[PDB]
Structure 1
Amino acid sequence: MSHYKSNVRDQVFNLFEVFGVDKVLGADKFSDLDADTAREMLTEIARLAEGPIAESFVEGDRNPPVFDPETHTVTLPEGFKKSMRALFDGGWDKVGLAEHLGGIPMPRALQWALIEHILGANPAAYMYAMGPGMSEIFYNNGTDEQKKWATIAAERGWGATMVLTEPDAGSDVGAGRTKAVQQPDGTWHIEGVKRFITSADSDDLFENIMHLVLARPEGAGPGTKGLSLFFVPKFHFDHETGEIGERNGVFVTNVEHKMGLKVSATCELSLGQHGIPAVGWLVGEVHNGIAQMFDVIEQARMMVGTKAIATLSTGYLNALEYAKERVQGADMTQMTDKTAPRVTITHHPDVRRSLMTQKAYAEGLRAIYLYTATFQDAEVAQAVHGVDGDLAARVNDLLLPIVKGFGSETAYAKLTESLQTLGGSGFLQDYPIEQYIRDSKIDSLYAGTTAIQAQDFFFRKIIRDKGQALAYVAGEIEQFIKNGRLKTERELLATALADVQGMAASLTGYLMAAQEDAASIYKVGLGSVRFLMAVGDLLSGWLLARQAAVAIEKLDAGATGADKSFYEGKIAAASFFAKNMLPLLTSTRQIIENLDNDVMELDEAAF
């Protein structure tokens, strides 16, 4: 079914009219890619997403993969594999890949806009297709000889996995017990059982799979510092030609039954447990595991956040299309009259409230991840923001937990409004929104839970950063607030910005107080997620207000037709968000300012 509804219009609005990413197209790194070609690419992949890729969305959930425990392999439904081949045949598993690996150079902001369509149409299909992007990470961290293997893996389209989690080491990656035994010739034998590994087998989609495995070398120290990263291929291969050889000793031994995202095989992975060594090669031939793996984690966190946002967007557009056609009830101005005309439900206030809530968050979230991506290239950050490379890296690092944590939590919550808009029909599998909800629930968990996002945000991206990136962003919001038709929105933003600054000061204060009373640190934990969500709301309202300022300029200049309607919606979204979402941060600030440890002192038996 054609469940997927795309929004290239909003993407191009952000990329060119708001952020001006076209400034760098046709110049330096992107010398061979112009704005017209970028638009055509977005339109092409959106068309592919709405057609062949979206067409197996239902099939993958209703006819999910089947595991053969004796072969340690998974069979995927044929319709989904056809969608994968459509993706490969169009070169879309090589989006933004380095030119020397066969890719088309482009800014990250354009790359994630392209990927959004796959994540909206069939997110597991993009996940299976992340191999080449992970081969590039292996390339960047590898020896000269390992770079040769990475080039083969990328050219041949091998799949890949990130292998961290164990039954007793999920959020606490440093507790992992999977071990690496050094061999005389410099290779390693990996031994352990890992859990919840995405794409650990993928039927016959690929020639090979590159497992990137965190493991502790024998006798290494404890914690994350003692971990190393290893290249562990499913098949041994000829390192010069790429010709596939003997099966390596790394076998899927279970596939989980999940709430959603069912077509993505989520696997228990056994290394060196079946009498065959799991041979691994030390990435870069250095012991720097968690640093190397965080290149992979950051990409995964960006993908998950963008996935949540893509899913909410098509959720909203499905609900909108339904509301426009569903006739139910009289206009509320006519409710007493038992003979009044029945109207389409977009006429009802609560439906317009729901739809505008969906719209504002979906479009605010789209702006967030594209804004985040403009700091992922130094050249783009310099051209559009005027910030140097170091600050740009700090700002991207600050925004990733917002994209991931705030994005995942918001999308799942607002999809509830999408389903509600359909009434009783929303509970039916006939419509895609119940699957959107199930497929999206994992986004608050995979690649680090929301709580982990919030702790990374505060401790690493603000405190350890000495507030530099946060002060930059705050300065940009302040400058927008300074400098008629958006006065009330700017006043509401000024209050929200002050609220967030108050929150940051309070949590910082609790951290300082921990010098004297260690228990005071618990208050940082108690408030960390609410703080992360508040910054997300602040950024959403700010970027929506920036969009409204651009929309006002285009309307003043004489926009007509569909363009005019688009711009009018941007003004309404920014105003609605500022008046209905931002004021809550004031109460949240007061709640955070009054946190106490009563709930930490309570006996566990009292719960």
Structure 2
Amino acid sequence: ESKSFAVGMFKGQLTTDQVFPYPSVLNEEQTQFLKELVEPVSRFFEEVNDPAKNDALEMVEETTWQGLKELGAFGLQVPSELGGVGLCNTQYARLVEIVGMHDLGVGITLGAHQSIGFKGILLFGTKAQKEKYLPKLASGETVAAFCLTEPSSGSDAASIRTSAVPSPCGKYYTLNGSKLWISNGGLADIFTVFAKTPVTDPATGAVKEKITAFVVERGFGGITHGPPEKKMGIKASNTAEVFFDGVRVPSENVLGEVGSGFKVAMHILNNGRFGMAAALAGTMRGIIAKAVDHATNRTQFGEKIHNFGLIQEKLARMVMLQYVTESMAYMVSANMDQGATDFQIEAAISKIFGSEAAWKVTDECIQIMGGMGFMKEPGVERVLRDLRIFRIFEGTNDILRLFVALQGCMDKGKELSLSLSGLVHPELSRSGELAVRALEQFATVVEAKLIKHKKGIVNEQFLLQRLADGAIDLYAMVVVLSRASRSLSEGHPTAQHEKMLCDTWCIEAAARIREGMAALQSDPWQQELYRNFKSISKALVERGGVVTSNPLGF
């Protein structure tokens, strides 16, 4: 039976192993080691890095780049014996939030390198491959890049065209194709490359085309890259086409099993996913400090503006968004450190929630600052620009919603083929009940929809996006119920404040789930909306844009 909360809640179960109590994973020594890293990393971003400069230059300033290499920043999760810092996921998250607070351009360059670029070697590498490649990865002597996307293939990884053909001797593969929008593409000397190869069935010998993952060195020859792409934000991060022209890849540079490269890609991306919400929790923390500072000190209509309800509500919503996001990020990383095998839905939720929360929080920080928020000098507009892509890469949020909904449905569909008392703190019992009723409402709809649509539920995308949103708010609720309950249990100095953040969040989340589930189940107009969305869009496509003229008709 799954220990995943998200897997259970689609089945109307309360599976709480990976949720309550809010996990603590670090031993005393890991805690002390992390403290002694947090200080120098924080000082480095404060004193050496200049985010506005990197953005202006469209690259990381060389002193900063070399300084990060010296700091160990290129190898945070590589074991010490292979020349890294040897951090676990939770320690990694703590340092990642520092980067996220200060410079997402730098963040993407370092995360492309290690969260995904050479991650597959950590996850699937043989001893030989790890010993060969990790030390120079960890020191940043060889930068890495994750090479999946192509001109034809973004969301649909299975459709990639880059190919790898085995030699007759079986000693190497010949690699041909191109990859698009590769972070560190123009900088990397090590590439994780996903290519279609012929795969022999063990029983019959029948040959089929499947993806295989490879570790590819720039020095193998036949590799070039395009010029850095110009883009809205994270402008300091290198983004480039990578070309593979008759590249000879040693057979021993297969990463994982021949033909299991799709699974390899998906595991790498799943594994790295929590890092995003971690970074963005930091982004939001920094941004909220700026918005609070503005509201504290700006007089308008005779008072400092923090005294006006519109501003108070904006600030309150921002911190709730930050708290939920940060709470998800550290829960998922703890689950991973504690040996969880089933956290993929929760990781997807955290990615969707965190990227959207950070976008909304930074958008409202601009609004609070007024005219000044739009100016370049305050640096907030630069962070908004950086943020836009986080909703699109590492799985578009639209595709991740489909994933959350369909993955959650899977086990309930297989089958078809409650109290938080004693877990939530007594001071949060009412919100705990809100969550349990929301779970019941959610599961009832899931069951009814699976019975109705069966396997054809996969094409019901209006419904699936709405189910995903229910799932997101349901996980958000129990994540903050857990964290605030532990705070209350421990008598932590912020516990009464966290209790308030939790109750405030839950009241509105429960309402979104109640009203959302009602729309799906009982609302006779819902099907008219769905029909009209399709007919309206069909009409736009026929026309190539807006169908109506303006009222004048020309």
- Both structures adopt the same fold (TM-score exceeding 0.5): yes
For 2:387 and 2:208, locate their aligned partners in 1 and report how far apart those are by CA, in whole Å. 29
1:189-338 map, 5 Å: 189-202=174-187, 209-217=189-197, 226-236=210-220, 248-272=221-245, 277=247, 279=249, 281-284=253-256, 286-329=258-301
Kindly indicate whether the alpha-carbon contact (under 8 Å) linking 2:298 and 2:304 is maintained by their aligned counterparts in 1.
Answer: yes
Indicate the residue corresponding to 1:408 in structure 2.
Answer: 355
1:363 to 308, 323, 330: 323
Kindly indicate whether the alpha-carbon contact (under 8 Å) linking 1:213 and 1:232 is maintained by their aligned counterparts in 2.
Answer: yes
For 2:490 and 2:299, locate their aligned partners in 1 and report how far apart those are by CA, in whole Å. 34
> How far has the Cα of 1:578 moved from its partner?
2.4
For 2:414 and 2:308, locate their aligned partners in 1 and report how far apart those are by CA, in whole Å. 45
> How far has the Cα of 1:600 moved from its partner?
7.1
For 1:279 and 1:422, locate their aligned partners in 2 and report how far apart those are by CA, in whole Å. 54
Structure 2 gap ranges (5+):
1-19, 541-554
> How far has the Cα of 1:171 moved from its partner?
0.9
For 1:302 and 1:549, locate their aligned partners in 2 and report how far apart those are by CA, in whole Å. 22
For 2:515 and 2:444, locate their aligned partners in 1 and report how far apart those are by CA, in whole Å. 11
1:493 to 435, 454, 462: 435
Call closer, same or farther: CA 1:509–1:354 in 2, change over 3 Å. farther
1:58 to 27, 52, 57: 52
Range that drifts further, 483-492 or 532-541? 483-492
- Is residue 2:514 matched to residue 1:586? yes
> How far has the Cα of 1:177 moved from its partner?
1.0
Kindly indicate whether the alpha-carbon contact (under 8 Å) linking 1:351 and 1:421 is maintained by their aligned counterparts in 2.
Answer: yes
1:16-43 Cα distance to aligned partner (Å, 9 max, x none): x974525x515xxxxxx24333334334
For 1:368 and 1:188, locate their aligned partners in 2 and report how far apart those are by CA, in whole Å. 42
1:497-512 map, 5 Å: 497-512=439-454
- Is residue 2:463 matched to residue 1:532? no
Letter in 2 for 1:99: S
1:195-220 Cα distance to aligned partner (Å, 9 max, x none): 11111013xxxxx6211111112588
> How far has the Cα of 1:511 moved from its partner?
4.2
- Is residue 2:134 matched to residue 1:148? no
Kindly indicate whether the alpha-carbon contact (under 8 Å) linking 1:200 and 1:265 is maintained by their aligned counterparts in 2.
Answer: yes
For 1:502 and 1:81, locate their aligned partners in 2 and report how far apart those are by CA, in whole Å. 57
Call closer, same or farther: CA 1:580–1:458 in 2, change over 3 Å. closer
2:367 to 420, 425, 428: 420
For 2:73 and 2:193, locate their aligned partners in 1 and report how far apart those are by CA, in whole Å. 26
Kindly indicate whether the alpha-carbon contact (under 8 Å) linking 1:160 and 1:209 is maintained by their aligned counterparts in 2.
Answer: yes
Letter in 2 for 1:216: K
Kindly indicate whether the alpha-carbon contact (under 8 Å) linking 1:214 and 1:230 is maintained by their aligned counterparts in 2.
Answer: yes
For 1:377 and 1:467, locate their aligned partners in 2 and report how far apart those are by CA, in whole Å. 29
2:24 to 21, 29, 47: 21
Indicate the residue corresponding to 1:335 in structure 2.
Answer: none
Tell me the SS of whatever aligns to 1:193: strand
Indicate the residue corresponding to 1:382 in structure 2.
Answer: none
> How far has the Cα of 1:351 moved from its partner?
0.9
- Is residue 2:154 matched to residue 1:170? yes
1:318-341 Cα distance to aligned partner (Å, 9 max, x none): 111211111222xxxxxxxxxxxx
Kindly indicate whether the alpha-carbon contact (under 8 Å) linking 2:474 and 2:509 is maintained by their aligned counterparts in 1.
Answer: no
1:432 to 371, 379, 385: 379
Kindly indicate whether the alpha-carbon contact (under 8 Å) linking 2:372 and 2:378 is maintained by their aligned counterparts in 1.
Answer: yes
Call closer, same or farther: CA 1:503–1:113 in 2, change over 3 Å. farther
> How far has the Cα of 1:50 moved from its partner?
3.1
1:529-568 map, 5 Å: 529-553=465-489, 563=493, 566-568=494-496
> How far has the Cα of 1:154 moved from its partner?
3.0
Kindly indicate whether the alpha-carbon contact (under 8 Å) linking 2:22 and 2:482 is maintained by their aligned counterparts in 1.
Answer: no
1:405-425 Cα distance to aligned partner (Å, 9 max, x none): 222222212322222111221
Call closer, same or farther: CA 1:490–1:189 in 2, change over 3 Å. same
For 1:155 and 1:260, locate their aligned partners in 2 and report how far apart those are by CA, in whole Å. 26
Indicate the residue corresponding to 1:239 in structure 2.
Answer: none
Kindly indicate whether the alpha-carbon contact (under 8 Å) linking 2:197 and 2:212 is maintained by their aligned counterparts in 1.
Answer: yes
> How far has the Cα of 1:371 moved from its partner?
0.5
Letter in 2 for 1:41: L
For 1:257 and 1:304, locate their aligned partners in 2 and report how far apart those are by CA, in whole Å. 22
Call closer, same or farther: CA 1:105–1:118 in 2, change over 3 Å. same
Identity of aligned residues (%): 18
2:337 to 369, 377, 387: 377
Indicate the residue corresponding to 1:575 in structure 2.
Answer: 503
Letter in 1 for 2:482: R
> How far has the Cα of 1:599 moved from its partner?
4.5
> How far has the Cα of 1:402 moved from its partner?
0.6
- Is residue 2:313 matched to residue 1:353? yes
Indicate the residue corresponding to 1:186 in structure 2.
Answer: 171
For 1:201 and 1:311, locate their aligned partners in 2 and report how far apart those are by CA, in whole Å. 27
Tell me the SS of whatever aligns to 2:515: helix
Tell me the SS of whatever aligns to 1:261: coil
Call closer, same or farther: CA 1:85–1:550 in 2, change over 3 Å. same
What's the TM-score, normalizing by structure 2? 0.82
Kindly indicate whether the alpha-carbon contact (under 8 Å) linking 2:276 and 2:351 is maintained by their aligned counterparts in 1.
Answer: yes
Kindly indicate whether the alpha-carbon contact (under 8 Å) linking 2:82 and 2:131 is maintained by their aligned counterparts in 1.
Answer: no
For 2:466 and 2:185, locate their aligned partners in 1 and report how far apart those are by CA, in whole Å. 35
Tell me the SS of whatever aligns to 1:422: helix
For 2:441 and 2:404, locate their aligned partners in 1 and report how far apart those are by CA, in whole Å. 17
Indicate the residue corresponding to 2:9 in structure 1.
Answer: none
For 2:369 and 2:153, locate their aligned partners in 1 and report how far apart those are by CA, in whole Å. 41
For 1:319 and 1:21, locate their aligned partners in 2 and report how far apart those are by CA, in whole Å. 31
1:505-541 Cα distance to aligned partner (Å, 9 max, x none): 34434542x4xxx4x5432x21323333333323333
Call closer, same or farther: CA 1:218–1:185 in 2, change over 3 Å. closer
> How far has the Cα of 1:285 moved from its partner?
6.3
Letter in 1 for 2:24: V
Range that drifts further, 499-508 or 82-91? 499-508
Structure 1 gap ranges (5+):
1-16, 27-32, 65-75, 203-207, 237-247, 330-341, 379-388, 469-474
> How far has the Cα of 1:445 moved from its partner?
0.8
Call closer, same or farther: CA 1:506–1:148 in 2, change over 3 Å. same
What's the TM-score, normalizing by structure 1? 0.75
Tell me the SS of whatever aligns to 1:124: helix
1:539-580 Cα distance to aligned partner (Å, 9 max, x none): 33333333433444566xxx7xxx4xx444323322322234
Letter in 1 for 2:46: E
Structure number with the bigger relative contact order (C-alpha 8 A, sep ≥ 6) is: 2
Call closer, same or farther: CA 1:418–1:252 in 2, change over 3 Å. same
Letter in 1 for 2:519: I
Kindly indicate whether the alpha-carbon contact (under 8 Å) linking 2:55 and 2:105 is maintained by their aligned counterparts in 1.
Answer: no
Indicate the residue corresponding to 1:49 in structure 2.
Answer: 45
- Is residue 2:79 matched to residue 1:98? yes
Tell me the SS of whatever aligns to 2:74: helix
Paired residues in the alignment total: 504
Kindly indicate whether the alpha-carbon contact (under 8 Å) linking 2:186 and 2:228 is maintained by their aligned counterparts in 1.
Answer: no
